[PDB]
Design an enzyme around this catalytic site. Structure first.
Site, short mmCIF file in Angstrom:
data_model
loop_
_atom_site.label_atom_id
_atom_site.label_comp_id
_atom_site.label_asym_id
_atom_site.label_seq_id
_atom_site.Cartn_x
_atom_site.Cartn_y
_atom_site.Cartn_z
N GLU A 85 -2.36 -2.88 -9.13
CA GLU A 85 -2.26 -1.54 -9.73
C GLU A 85 -1.04 -1.51 -10.62
O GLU A 85 -0.03 -2.20 -10.42
CB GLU A 85 -2.33 -0.48 -8.61
N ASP A 113 -6.07 -2.83 -5.50
CA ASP A 113 -4.70 -2.33 -5.69
C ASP A 113 -3.62 -3.36 -5.38
O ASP A 113 -2.57 -3.40 -6.04
CB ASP A 113 -4.49 -1.07 -4.89
N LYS A 139 -15.10 5.45 -0.36
CA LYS A 139 -14.63 4.10 -0.78
C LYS A 139 -15.52 3.03 -0.13
O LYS A 139 -15.85 2.06 -0.79
CB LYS A 139 -13.18 3.84 -0.37
C1 LIG Z 1 -9.18 1.95 -12.04
N1 LIG Z 1 -8.89 3.04 -11.13
C2 LIG Z 1 -8.20 2.77 -9.98
O1 LIG Z 1 -7.68 1.66 -9.80
C3 LIG Z 1 -8.22 3.85 -9.02
C4 LIG Z 1 -7.80 3.70 -7.67
O2 LIG Z 1 -7.23 2.63 -7.17
C5 LIG Z 1 -8.02 4.84 -6.72
O3 LIG Z 1 -7.66 4.67 -5.48
C6 LIG Z 1 -8.55 6.01 -7.20
C7 LIG Z 1 -8.91 6.13 -8.51
N2 LIG Z 1 -8.72 5.11 -9.33
N3 LIG Z 1 -8.95 5.40 -10.71
C8 LIG Z 1 -9.65 4.29 -11.29
C9 LIG Z 1 -10.01 4.63 -12.74
C10 LIG Z 1 -8.79 5.04 -13.55
C11 LIG Z 1 -7.96 6.15 -12.91
C12 LIG Z 1 -6.61 6.30 -13.62
C13 LIG Z 1 -6.66 6.56 -15.12
F1 LIG Z 1 -7.07 7.83 -15.33
F2 LIG Z 1 -5.40 6.46 -15.63
C14 LIG Z 1 -8.75 7.46 -12.83
C15 LIG Z 1 -7.99 8.58 -12.11
C16 LIG Z 1 -7.17 8.14 -10.92
C17 LIG Z 1 -6.58 9.11 -10.13
C18 LIG Z 1 -5.73 8.77 -9.09
C19 LIG Z 1 -5.45 7.42 -8.86
C20 LIG Z 1 -6.03 6.45 -9.66
C21 LIG Z 1 -6.95 6.80 -10.65
C22 LIG Z 1 -7.67 5.73 -11.45
MN LIG Z 2 -6.70 2.78 -5.05
MN LIG Z 3 -6.59 0.88 -8.25
#
Ligand SMILES: CN1C(=O)c2c(O)c(=O)ccn2N2[C@H]1CC[C@@]1(CC(F)F)CCc3ccccc3[C@@H]21
Ligand SMILES: [Mn+2]
Ligand SMILES: [Mn+2]
Length: 200
Positions: A85, A113, A139
């Site tokens: 991350e 992550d 999840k």
């Molecule tokens: C690739 N993403 C992750 O790695 C991810 C997580 O690890 C998670 O536990 C929950 C959501 N995730 N997502 C997705 C998609 C991209 C975001 C971030 C982007 F908007 F800048 C979408 C919004 C968001 C909100 C909170 C935390 C993270 C994220 C991201």
């Molecule tokens: Mn996550």
């Molecule tokens: Mn992530």
């Protein structure tokens, strides 16, 4: 009291490095931090949790997992966790692919992550303002038979992890839960918590 700005709260609560990585991530995914402010806060929180999970955990010169909180680890000590991350997608997958070449662990379908060099597994960190079992099951129903271990934290101190396997000691997890409690209470002080809780 008065309703604060989530922008002001984020810039004061989180270290500048966390805020910068969160801004970078939202630009990559086409989200404006100035508009999607509750999402910016959620991204900062989740980043901070990922860093806190890794903080102080090392593999020593004997290959043993230890905790060094002094701030000054000697250069024989390896971080126990790789942090995936916070990296742009290219570098994130470059790090994932490099770990899979080093360890022989299966390449994950979804970007995780962290990677745990002790347990030899990727980790998906979740942070929720909802009931932890609900977010765990969301999840789980995404990851399915992927070998990524899930660990969910709530803002109320509940946790849920794959097969009841929590990875870290209680004190390490209590540091994370204390930080989430602090974020919730400071949000509430600024009358931000209600919008933040309901935007999930
Ligand atoms: C690739 N993403 C992750 O790695 C991810 C997580 O690890 C998670 O536990 C929950 C959501 N995730 N997502 C997705 C998609 C991209 C975001 C971030 C982007 F908007 F800048 C979408 C919004 C968001 C909100 C909170 C935390 C993270 C994220 C991201
Ligand atoms: Mn996550
Ligand atoms: Mn992530």
């Amino acid at each position: 009291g008065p309703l604060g700005s989530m922008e002001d709260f984020v810039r004061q609560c989180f270290n500048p490095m966390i805020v910068e990585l969160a801004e970078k991530a939202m630009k990559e995914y086409g989200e404006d931090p100035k508009i999607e402010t509750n999402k910016f806060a959620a991204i900062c929180t989740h980043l901070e949790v990922c860093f806190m999970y890794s903080d102080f955990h090392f593999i020593d010169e004997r290959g043993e997992s230890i905790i060094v909180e002094s701030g000054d680890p000697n250069a024989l000590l390896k971080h126990r966790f790789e942090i995936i991350e916070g990296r742009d997608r290219i570098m994130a997958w470059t790090v994932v692919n490099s770990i899979c070449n080093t360890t022989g662990v299966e390449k994950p379908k979804f970007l995780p992550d962290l990677y745990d060099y002790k347990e030899n597994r990727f980790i998906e960190i979740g942070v929720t303002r909802r009931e932890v079992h609900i977010y765990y099951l969301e999840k789980a129903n995404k990851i399915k038979s992927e070998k990524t271990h899930i660990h969910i934290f709530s803002f109320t101190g509940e946790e849920m992890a794959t097969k009841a396997d929590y990875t870290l000691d209680e004190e390490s997890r209590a540091r994370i839960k204390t930080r989430l409690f602090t974020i919730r209470q400071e949000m509430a002080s600024r009358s931000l918590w209600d919008s933040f809780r309901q935007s999930e």
